Amino acid sequence: NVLPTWSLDSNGEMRSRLSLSEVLDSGDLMKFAVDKTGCQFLEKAVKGSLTSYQKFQLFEQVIGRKDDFLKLSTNIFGNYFVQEIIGMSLTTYDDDNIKRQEKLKNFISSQMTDMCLDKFACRVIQSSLQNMDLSLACKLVQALPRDARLIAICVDQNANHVIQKVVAVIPLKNWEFIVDFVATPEHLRQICFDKYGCRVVQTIIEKLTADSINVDLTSAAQHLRERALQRLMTSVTNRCQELATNEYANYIIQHIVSNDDLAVYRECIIEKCLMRNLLSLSQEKFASHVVEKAFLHAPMELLAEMMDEIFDGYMPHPGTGKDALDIMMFHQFGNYVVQCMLTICCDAVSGRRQHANSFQVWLKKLHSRVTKERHRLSRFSSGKKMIETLAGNLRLMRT
RNA sequence: CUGUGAAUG
């Protein structure tokens, strides 16, 4: 352990009869907070009844000294106690509440970048952002780096939650530079192709979309949100080809297709990169889900083609005579697309979806195809799921 | 014959 000598028994361990006031008066609370046993003692002690003097001491010794606060926030054990004391200070409304919040804001702003990338200090940052004064939380947001480190924070396993929290609890006026920074084409690729940066971008997109819980307050707020949304959507749709096939970015595309409030952009995504490539994209591991979402959420006018491309939109193979449907139906990733196409037709002819005769024609074509090869499809689980619903890249030449 | 995305004691 790292406990001070005064608080140890003759075996070198922490004394059993120890009180919180002794630790506070000794001025060695720091050594206790970074220790595994001492921090547990402190968390036990502060959970009881505390006098105003003890609250004052805790505030000053935990969140009142910059170097001490930074050392505790970046500690594996100390960060929990720091969050506890932060919440306690915010919930204590005396003549020093705003002053303690000001000191907290300054302490965190002086090391923002390094604290976001810290596995323990980012917890402190998030815990402050959602409970501290909004006036000072917005000021905290402005300490975020603007150079390449902002990419790091976005792609960091821990620091991405900080950016998503900022997006969740801070008005867009204060983090619009983040939208503009992600919208950069050289940054959008790096951030979207990352495991956690993709979550960051999807969270930003979801916040900039007006819906039931995202209700605009003023005309200025609505205009700001919609202009930021348009700026980000142009960047996304200019390189939607490489995003829809990426192992992580594809989700983003799916979102823009699944969300009915992004209809416009959805349709653009279908016409710019999806169309004339339904086969090869249906044969992709990650883009096949994008094709499924497109089939599920395309307007009737675009769904009409999306069917006609797979039906009569590719030249059959001159060697085997297989068309698009035959190649996709036996494909490891395209059979899910075929099942989705079957499902939309089975749902429209029943009453789940509303040109009604075109669905009859499409379902009759697909039903013919499935009934024809009942053997091979019965050999697989995909065809097993097809028949119940009714009850390696191989491309082709465009027609 | 099934197919892909979040970090502390």
Residue A140's contacts (CB-CB under 8 Å, 6 or more residues apart) are A105, A108, A109, A112, A125, A128, A129, A132
Q: What's the 3-state SS for A304-323?
A: HHHHHHHHHCEECCCCCCCC
A315: containing domain: 276-399
Contact A129, A165 (CB under 8 A): yes
User: A145 — phi, psi (to 5°)?
Assistant: -65, 150
| CA/C1' separation A176–B7 (Å) | 25
Could you tell me if A209 and A262 are in contact, meaning their C-beta atoms sit under 8 angstroms apart? Answer: yes
Which nucleotide has its C1' atom closest to residue A290's CA? B4
Write phi, then psi, for A237 (nearest 5 degrees): -80, -15
Question: Closest residue by Cα to the C1' atom of nucleotide B4?
Answer: A286
- Measured at the CA of A243, the angle between CA A242 and CA A246, to 5 degrees, comes to 85
Based on the domain organization, do A103 and A180 belong to the same domain? no
Contacts of A217 (CB under 8 A, 6+ apart): none
Of A214, A247, A274, which one is at a domain's C-terminal end? A274
Instruction: Report which secondary-structure segment, H or E, holds A397.
Output: strand A397-398
Taking the C1' atom of every nucleotide in all shown strands and the CA of A84, the nearest one is B9
Gap between the Cα atoms of A373 and A365, Å rounded = 13
Q: Name the residue with tokens 């952002």.
A: A129
Residues A123, A81 contacting (CB under 8 angstroms)? no
Same domain? For A391 and A368 the reply is yes
- Would you state the torsion angle of the CA atoms of residues A64, A122, A163, A173, taken in this order, to the nearest 10 degrees? 0
Encode A199-236: b = buried (16+ Cβ within 10 Å), e = exposed: bbbbbbbbbbbeeeeeeeeeeeeeebbeebbeebbebb
> How far: A156 CA to B7 C1' (Å)?
9
Within 10 angstroms of residue A300's Cβ, the number of other Cβ atoms is: 13
Q: What is the CA A163 to C1' B6 distance in angstroms?
A: 12
As a whole number of Å, the end-to-end CA separation of chain A is: 75
Contact A46, A88 (CB under 8 A): yes
What gap in Å lies between CA A383 and CA A389, rounded to an integer? 10
Nucleotides of strand B lying closer than 7 angstroms to a protein CB: 1-9
Whether A265 and A309 share a structural domain: no
The nt closest to A119 (CA vs C1′) is B8
Residues A261 and A359 in one domain: no
Which of A241, A314, A331 has its CA nearest to residue A276? A314
Measure A305 CA to B8 C1' (Å): 51
Task: Name the nucleotide with the smallest C1'–CA separation from A340.
Answer: B3
User: Scanning the structure block, which residue is given the tokens 């792609």?
Assistant: A155
Q: To the nearest 10°, report the CA torsion of A299, A301, A303, A308.
A: -170
How far apart (Å, rounded) are the C-alpha atoms in residues A128 and A73?
A: 12
Same domain for A95 and A61: yes
Nearest CA among A282, A283, A286 for reference residue A247: A286
Smallest CA–C1' separation from A292: which nucleotide? B3
One domain for residues A290 and A368: yes
Return the CATH number at A244. 1.25.10.10
B3 C1' to A267 CA distance, Å? 25
Question: Length of chain A, please?
Answer: 399
* Minimum-distance residue to B5 (CA–C1'): A248
Residues A28, A136: one domain?
A: yes
In this complex, which residue's CA is closest to the C1' atom of nucleotide B8? A120
A306 lies in the same domain as A388: yes
Q: Which nucleotide is nearest to A158 (CA to C1')?
A: B7
Q: Of A241, A274, A307, which residue sits at a domain end?
A: A274
| Protein-to-nucleotide distance from the CA of A251 to the C1' of B4, whole angstroms | 9
Distances (CA, A) of A304 to A287, A314, A357: 20, 15, 11
Residue A263's Cβ-side half-sphere holds a number of Cα atoms within 13 Å equal to 6
List all residues 6 or more positions away from A336 whose beta carbon is below 8 Å from its beta carbon: A288, A292, A382
Q: Nearest-CA residue to the C1' of B9?
A: A77
Residues 6+ apart with CB under 8 A from A127: A83, A86, A87
How many angstroms is C1' of B8 away from CA of A39?
15
Residues 6+ apart with CB under 8 A from A182: A154, A188, A191, A200, A201, A204, A232, A235
Neighbour count for residue A92 (Cβ, 10 Å): 16
Q: How far apart are CA A222 and CA A381, in angstroms?
A: 49
Residue with tokens 């503009």: A180
Question: A27 with A123, same domain?
Answer: yes
A339 CA, B1 C1': Å apart: 13
What single DSSP character describes residue A8?
Answer: B
Q: Which of A135, A75, A139, A154 is nearest to A109 (CA)?
A: A139
- Residues A303 and A225 grouped into a single domain: no
Q: What crossing angle do the helices spanning A52-63 and A97-109 adopt, rounded to 10°?
A: 20
Nucleotide nearest to A247 (CA to C1'): B4
Rounded to whole angstroms, the distance from the CA of residue A17 to the C1' of nucleotide B1 is: 66
The data reach a resolution, in angstroms, of 2.7
CA A358 centroid distance within chain: 38
B3: residue with closest CA to C1': A333
Tell me how far apart the alpha carbons of residues A168 and A207 are, in angstroms, rounded to a whole number. Answer: 7
Distance A333 CA to B1 C1' (A): 10
Question: Quick check: helix, strand or coil at residue A355?
Answer: coil
Nucleotide nearest to A287 (CA to C1'): B4
Distances (CA, A) of A189 to A30, A73, A194, A268: 43, 33, 9, 19
Number of separate domains in chain A: 3
Q: Which of A245, A274, A303 is the last residue of a domain?
A: A274
Query: Are A260 and A284 members of one domain?
Result: no
- The string of DSSP codes covering A74-125 is TSTTHHHHHHHHHHHHHT--STTHHHHHHHHHHHHHTTHHHHHTSTTHHHHH
Whether residue A89 sits in one domain with residue A11: yes
Residues A246 and A194: their CA atoms lie apart, in Å, by 10
